Amino acid sequence: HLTPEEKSAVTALWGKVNVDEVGGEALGRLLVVYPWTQRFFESFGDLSTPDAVMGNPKVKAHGKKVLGAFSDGLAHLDNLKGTFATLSELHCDKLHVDPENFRLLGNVLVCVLAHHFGKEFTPPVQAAYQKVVAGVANALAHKYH
Amino acid sequence: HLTPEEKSAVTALWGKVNVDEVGGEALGRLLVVYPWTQRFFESFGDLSTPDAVMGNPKVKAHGKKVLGAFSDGLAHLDNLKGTFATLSELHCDKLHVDPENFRLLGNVLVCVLAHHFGKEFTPPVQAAYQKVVAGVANALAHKYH
Amino acid sequence: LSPADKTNVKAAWGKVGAHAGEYGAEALERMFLSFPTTKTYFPHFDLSHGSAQVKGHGKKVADALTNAVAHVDDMPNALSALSDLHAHKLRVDPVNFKLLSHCLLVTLAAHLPAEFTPAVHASLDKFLASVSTVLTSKYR
Amino acid sequence: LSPADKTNVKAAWGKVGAHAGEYGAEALERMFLSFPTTKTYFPHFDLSHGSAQVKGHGKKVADALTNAVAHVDDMPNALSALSDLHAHKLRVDPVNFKLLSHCLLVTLAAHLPAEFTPAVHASLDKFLASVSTVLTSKYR
Numbered sequence: 001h002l003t004p005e006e007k008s009a010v011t012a013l014w015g016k017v018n019v020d021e022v023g024g025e026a027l028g029r030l031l032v033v034y035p036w037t038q039r040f041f042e043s044f045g046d047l048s049t050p051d052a053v054m055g056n057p058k059v060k061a062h063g064k065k066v067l068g069a070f071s072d073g074l075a076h077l078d079n080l081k082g083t084f085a086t087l088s089e090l091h092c093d094k095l096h097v098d099p100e101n102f103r104l105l106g107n108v109l110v111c112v113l114a115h116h117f118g119k120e121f122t123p124p125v126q127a128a129y130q131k132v133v134a135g136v137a138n139a140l141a142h143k144y145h
Numbered sequence: 146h147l148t149p150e151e152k153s154a155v156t157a158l159w160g161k162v163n164v165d166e167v168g169g170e171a172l173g174r175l176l177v178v179y180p181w182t183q184r185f186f187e188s189f190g191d192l193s194t195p196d197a198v199m200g201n202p203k204v205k206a207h208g209k210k211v212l213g214a215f216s217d218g219l220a221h222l223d224n225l226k227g228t229f230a231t232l233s234e235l236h237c238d239k240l241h242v243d244p245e246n247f248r249l250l251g252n253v254l255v256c257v258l259a260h261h262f263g264k265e266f267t268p269p270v271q272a273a274y275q276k277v278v279a280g281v282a283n284a285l286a287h288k289y290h
Numbered sequence: 291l292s293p294a295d296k297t298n299v300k301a302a303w304g305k306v307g308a309h310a311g312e313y314g315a316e317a318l319e320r321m322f323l324s325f326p327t328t329k330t331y332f333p334h335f336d337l338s339h340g341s342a343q344v345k346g347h348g349k350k351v352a353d354a355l356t357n358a359v360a361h362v363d364d365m366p367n368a369l370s371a372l373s374d375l376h377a378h379k380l381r382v383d384p385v386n387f388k389l390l391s392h393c394l395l396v397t398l399a400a401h402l403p404a405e406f407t408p409a410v411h412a413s414l415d416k417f418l419a420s421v422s423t424v425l426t427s428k429y430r
Numbered sequence: 431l432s433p434a435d436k437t438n439v440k441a442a443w444g445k446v447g448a449h450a451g452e453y454g455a456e457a458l459e460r461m462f463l464s465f466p467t468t469k470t471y472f473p474h475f476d477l478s479h480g481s482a483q484v485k486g487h488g489k490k491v492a493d494a495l496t497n498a499v500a501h502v503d504d505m506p507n508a509l510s511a512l513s514d515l516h517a518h519k520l521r522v523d524p525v526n527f528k529l530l531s532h533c534l535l536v537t538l539a540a541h542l543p544a545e546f547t548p549a550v551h552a553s554l555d556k557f558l559a560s561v562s563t564v565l566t567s568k569y570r
C-alpha cells in the first residue's frame with residue numbers, strides 16, 4: 001500500500017533510471033555478493049571475479065529483462081500478483097529459484113539506486129521502494145504458496 | 146493445495162491430537178528454541194528455563210487458542226486468507242511480530258506432531274502438514290503484503 | 291553453543307547410534323517430499339522410498355554429523371573438505387540447509403520421544419545451524 | 431572473511447570518518463521508515479527526523495562498528511557486552527539485524543559511491559553479517 005506522495009516520488013526517481021545498465025548492475029552484484037545465485041547462470045560463461053560478472057554481456061542482457069519486469073510492476077502497483085503471474089510460474093516451477101533470493105535481488109536493486117542517486121535516494125524514498133521490491137518478491141513467490 | 150488423500154491423512158492425525166496439550170507444547174517449544182519470541186510475552190512471567198516455559202498455565206491456555214486457530218484453518222483450507230484475516234490484523238498491525246516467526250512456530254508444531262505420533266507421522270504426512278503450516282504462516286502474514 | 295548444548299547433543303547421538311544412516315536417509319526423503327526443489331541438486335539420483343542412493347547418501351550426511359559431534363569444539367576444520375564441495379561445486383542455496391536441518395529434527399522427534407525434550411530440541415537446532423554455517427562459509 | 435575483505439572494509443569505513451554518527455543515525459531512520467516493526471524496540475525514543483535520541487543512538491552503533499572494523503580478527507570477545515544486551519535483555523529478533531545491515535549498506539552506497547564497488551559491497555555485507563552473528567550468538 002503506497003501512499004499517493006510516495007507513489008509520486010517512486011515514478012519521479014524511476015524516470016531518471018537508465019533502463020540499459022541498472023538491471024545488469026543489480027543482477028551482477030547479486031552474483032558477486034550472493035555467489036550461490038550463479039548456479040542458475042552457469043550457461044552465462046565467465047563469472048570467476050566481480051570484474052568478469054560485471055563485464056558479462058549475458059548478465060547485462062538478462063539484467064535488462066529483469067529490470068523491464070520491475071518497470072511493469074511499477075506501472076501496475078494495484079495488480080502486482082497478476083503482473084508477475086507467468087514469471088512466478090516460471091521462477092518457481094521451471095527455474096526452481098528459492099523465493100528468498102527475490103528478497104535479496106530487491107535489496108541489491110535498492111543498493112544500486114542508492115549508489116546512483118545518492119542524496120536523492122532519501123530514507124522516505126527508500127521506504128517507498130522497499131514497499132515495491134517487497135511487493136514484487138511476494139508477487140514472484142505466489143506459485144510457491 | 147493438498148491432494149484428496151493428503152486432506153484425509155491430515156484430518157485423521159488432527160483427530161487424535163490432544164486439543165489441550167499440543168498447542169501449549171508448540172508455543173512452549175518456540176520460546177525455548179528461539180528465545181527472542183519471549184519478548185512478546187512479558188505478561189506471562191518466568192520463561193528463563195524450559196520447565197518454567199512448559200509449566201506455565203498462561204502458555205498452556207494461550208497455546209489452546211493457537212491450536213484452535215490451526216483447527217479453524219484446517220476447516221477452511223480454501224479460504225485461509227479470510228480465516229486468519231482478523232488475527233493477521235492483530236499480529237501485524239498491533240503486536241508488530243515479524244512474519245518469519247510464523248514459519249518457525251509452524252515448523253515447531255511439525256516437530257511436536259512428529260514427537261507425539263512417532264512413525265504415524267510419515268514423510269508424506271509431514272509434506273502435507275508442511276503445506277498447511279506454510280499456508281497458515283502466509284495467511285497470518287497477509288497484512289504485511 | 292553452551293556447555294549444556296554439547297551435553298544434550300552428545301546424549302542425542304547416543305540414542306541414535308547405529309540408526310544414523312536410516313535417520314539420515316529418512317531426513318533426506320522428508321526434505322525431498324516436503325520441499326521438492328531440493329531434488330534438482332541430485333540429477334542422476336533415484337529419490338523414491340527405499341532407494342539405494344538415498345540410503346547411501348543418508349549414511350554419508352549422518353557420518354559427517356557423527357564426526358561433528360566428536361569435533362564439537364573444532365567444527366570449521368573438521369568439515370574443511372566438505373565446505374569446498376557445497377560452496378564451490380554444488381553451490382547449495384543456504385536456505386536448503388535450514389530445510390534439511392528441520393527434517394533432521396523431525397526425524398529425531400519421531401524416533402526419540404523421551405530424548406526430544408524442549409531443552410534438547412533447542413540444543414540440536416543450534417548444532418545443525420553451526421554445521422550449516424560451516425558448509426556455507428567458502429562462498430566466492 | 432578474506433584478507434581482501436578486511437582491506438576493503440577498513441578502506442570503506444576509513445572514508446566514513448567523522449560522518450560516522452550521521453551515517454548510523456541515517457541507517458536507523460532508513461530502518462524505522464522502511465521497516466516499521468523495528469520501531470517497537472524504541473517506544474521511549476522520539477523517532478521523528480533529527481531527534482536527539484536517534485542522533486545519539488546512531489553514534490553508538492557507528493562507534494561499535496568502528497570497534498568491530500578494528501577488532502575484525504577477534505570480534506566475539508570485543509562485542510560481548512552488546513551480544514548479551516541485544517539477545518538476553520532487548521530480545522532482538524535476528525531478522526532485524528538483516529534489516530539494519532541492508533540500511534547501513536544503503537547509507538554507504540548513498541554517501542560513498544566511488545567506494546561502493548561490487549567487491550567492497552560484498553565485503554561490507556560479509557562483515558555486517560559477522561557483527562550480526564556475534565550480536566545473536568548469546569541466546570539461551
Ligand code: HEM
Nearest residue numbers: 037040041065066069070095097101102105106136137140
Ligand atoms: C525478484 C525479481 C525478479 C524478476 C522481476 C526476474 C525477472 C526475470 C525475467 C523477466 C526473466 C525472463 C523470462 C522470459 O524471457 O520469459 C527471468 C529469467 C530468469 N530468472 Fe529471474 N527475475 C527475478 C529474480 C530472479 C532471481 C533472484 C534469480 C536467481 C537467483 C532469477 C533467475 C532467473 C533465471 C535462471 C532465469 C532464466 C535465465 C535464462 O537462462 O534465460 N531471477 N527473470
Ligand code: HEM
Nearest residue numbers: 328331332350351354355372375380382386387390421425
Ligand atoms: C547437514 C548438512 C549436510 C551435510 C552433513 C551434508 C553432507 C554431505 C556429504 C558428506 C556429502 C558427500 C561428501 C563427499 O563425497 O566428498 C554430500 C554431498 C552432497 N550434498 Fe550434502 N550435506 C548437507 C546438506 C546438503 C543440502 C542441504 C543439499 C541440497 C539440498 C546437499 C546436497 C548435496 C549434493 C548434491 C551432494 C553431492 C551428491 C552427489 O551428487 O554425489 N547437501 N553432502
Ligand code: HNI
Nearest residue numbers: 182185186210211214215232240242246247250251282285
Ligand atoms: C512470537 C510471537 C507470536 C507468534 C509466532 C504467533 C503465532 C501464531 C500462530 C501461528 C503462526 C497462530 C495460529 C496464532 C494464533 C493466535 N495468536 Ni499468535 N503468535 C505470536 C504472538 C501472539 C501474542 C503476543 C498474542 C497475544 C494477543 C492477545 O490479544 O491475547 C497472540 C495471540 C494469538 C491468538 C489469540 C488472540 C486473542 O484471543 O485476542 C491466536 C488465536 N499471538 N499465533
Ligand code: HNI
Nearest residue numbers: 468471472490491494495512520522526527530561562565
Ligand atoms: C531493531 C533492533 C536492533 C538492532 C537490529 C540492533 C542492532 C545493533 C547493531 C548491529 C549492526 C549494532 C552495532 C548495535 C549497537 C548498539 N545497540 Ni542495538 N540494535 C537494536 C536495538 C537496540 C536497542 C533497543 C538498544 C537499547 C537502546 C537504548 O540505549 O535505550 C540498542 C542499543 C545499542 C547500543 C548501546 C549500548 C548500551 O546501551 O550500552 C549499541 C552500541 N540496540 N545495535
